[PDB]
Amino acid sequence: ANFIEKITYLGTPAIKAGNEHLEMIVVPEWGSNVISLVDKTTNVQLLREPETAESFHDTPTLYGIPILFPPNRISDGTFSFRGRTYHFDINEKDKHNHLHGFLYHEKWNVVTTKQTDEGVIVETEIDLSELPHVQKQFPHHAVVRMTYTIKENTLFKHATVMNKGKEAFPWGIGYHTTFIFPAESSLFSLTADQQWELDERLLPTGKLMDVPYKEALHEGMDLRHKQLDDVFLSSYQKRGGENQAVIYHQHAHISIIYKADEQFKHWVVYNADGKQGYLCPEPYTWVTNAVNLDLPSSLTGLQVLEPGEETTAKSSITIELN
Numbered sequence: 001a002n003f004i005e006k007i008t009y010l011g012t013p014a015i016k017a018g019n020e021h022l023e024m025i026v027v028p029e030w031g032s033n034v035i036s037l038v039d040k041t042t043n044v045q046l047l048r049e050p051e052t053a054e055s056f057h058d059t060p061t062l063y064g065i066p067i068l069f070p071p072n073r074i075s076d077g078t079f080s081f082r083g084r085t086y087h088f089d090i091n092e093k094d095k096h097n098h099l100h101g102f103l104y105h106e107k108w109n110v111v112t113t114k115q116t117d118e119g120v121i122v123e124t125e126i127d128l129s130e131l132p133h134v135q136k137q138f139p140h141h142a143v144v145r146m147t148y149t150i151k152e153n154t155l156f157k158h159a160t161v162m163n164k165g166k167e168a169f170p171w172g173i174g175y176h177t178t179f180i181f182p183a184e185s186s187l188f189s190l191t192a193d194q195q196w197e198l199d200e201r202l203l204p205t206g207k208l209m210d211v212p213y214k215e216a217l218h219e220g221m222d223l224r225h226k227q228l229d230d231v232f233l234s235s236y237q238k239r240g241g242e243n244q245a246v247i248y249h250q251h252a253h254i255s256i257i258y259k260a261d262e263q264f265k266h267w268v269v270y271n272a273d274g275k276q277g278y279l280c281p282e283p284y285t286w287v288t289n290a291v292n293l294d295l296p297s298s299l300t301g302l303q304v305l306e307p308g309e310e311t312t313a314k315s316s317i318t319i320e321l322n
Contacts (some may be wrong), residue, residue, distance in 0.1 A: 002120045002150075004113050009035060010053040015110065017120045021153045022319060024122075027064075030056060032108035032124040032146050035064035037155060039319045044252050046319070048178040048278045057105070061176045062278075065157070066104040069144060071174030072231075072268060072288040073097040075203055077137075079291035081170045088137045095201040100176070102134045103144065111145065119151040129164075141165030142305075144173075147312075154318040161313070163305040170304050172286030173313060174268070179247055179256065181271070181279035187220035187248040188279060190267060191241065192232035196287060203289045208233060220248050223279070228269045231288050236262060237298070245269075245281035253322040258283070261314040265301035285313055 002019040014027045018040070025036035035056075037046045050056035050063045060066060077088035077098035088098035103126060112123035125145040128134050141164040149156040159173050181188070195211050196204040211217060211232065236243040243264060247256040260267075260283035268282040286301040287293065293300050305311065 002115050004115060004120060004122065010050065010056065012053065015113070015122055017122050017148070017150060019120055019150050019152075022150050022155060024148065024150065024155060026122055026124065026148060028110050028124050029107045031060060031067055031104040031106060032126070033060070033064040033066055033104070034148065034155070034157070037317065039254060041319075041321055042252055042254055044249070044254065046179055046256060046317075048180055060105045061100055062178055062280075064178060066100075066176035066178075067144075067146070067159075068174040068176055068282070068284070069101040069103045070172040070286065071101065071282070071284045073099050073201070073203055075201065075289055075292055081291065082168070086138065097201060097203070102128065102131065102138065104176070106131060108146070112147075119149045119156075122148045124148075127164075138169070140167065140169040142169060142171065153320065154316050156314070156316045158312050158314045160310055161305060162310040163307055166307050168304055168306045170291060170302060172284065172290060172301060172303065174264075174282050174284035175315070176270075176280055176282055177258065178278050178280050180277065181223075181247060182249075182251075182277060183222070183224050183271075183274060183279075185250045187250065188217075188223055188269075188281070189220045189246045189248075190217050190232060190269065190281065191235045191243055191245075192217065192267060193235045193238070194233045196231040196233065196266075198231065198288075202229065204231065204287060204293060206293055206295060220246065223271060223274065225274070226271075227274050228271045230269055232267045232269065233287075233299075234260075234265050234267060237265065243283075245283075247279070247281075248322070255320045255322055257318040257320060259316050259318070263301070263303070263311075263313040264315065265299075283315055
């Protein structure tokens with residue numbers, strides 16, 4: 001059994017979709033944010049939802065599943081690529097950075113709604129050539145299409161990035177996925193052994209370091225007394241195996257398994273002061289400030305789309321009852 005339904009969410013049009021296991025709400029006008037994800041077996045909301053529309057507009061990267069194109073910081077908003085210098089707006093004023101890209105608070109179009117016995121599918125899309133202020137910063141005909149598919153106990157969340165223009169461009173994507181996380185009774189794990197050393201502007205120095213608590217991080221750990229805003233290197237390319245973050249909710253007896261494909265070479269983990277009741281395990285295709293690191297792209301995750309090319313970067317959220 002399954003459904004797709006147009007609804008109003010905090011005064012804004014939205015799409016509710018689900019099956020017998022999982023229900024999502026995506027808000028196309030709000031950066032195609034998947035604002036709600038409910039496990040129907042347990043009736044548990046998994047994502048942090050805003051309590052007013054104004055609250056969402058105040059902090060649109062701290063609710064639901066915000067789309068970060070590109071993710072995290074670029075020093076001084078400035079980088080060079082094939083001889084061309086780019087200047088993105090410096091929205092992080094104290095650290096003098098560009099932060100979190102172009103798409104989390106723009107209107108995306110709904111382009112597909114389909115249901116079968118195999119999956120419920122919603123696709124949204126945005127064409128950056130239709131955003132004049134973005135074109136000032138990033139003058140490329142980039143198009144991003146999100147494919148959300150609910151099948152059994154999984155939300156598949158795929159991003160297809162397309163170059164419809166006449167010149168190549170560099171790109172990365174990430175998500176600022178904001179899960180409810182009661183630190184007194186949930187545990188967190190991640191496939192990472194190393195992390196990037198950061199400077200005072202939260203930019204990588206270029207050095208990798210051991211994660212001191214990596215064993216605990218593999219096992220599932222208590223994050224009480226830990227403030228995280230850390231850039232982890234996925235262990236997948238070195239060790240093979242999995243590329244995923246897991247939240248275990250001990251009271252609800254459910255595990256959230258957040259998988260990402262090989263493009264997602266880094267994870268940022270953010271929990272603010274640790275007392276806000278949420279946790280953001282953020283898979284990124286490129287490391288913070290990738291465009292300004294003199295390191296190979298196998299490590300930074302920097303990607304380039306030539307004219308006419310596209311690529312699909314895949315991730316998924318699976319809910320398991322323990």
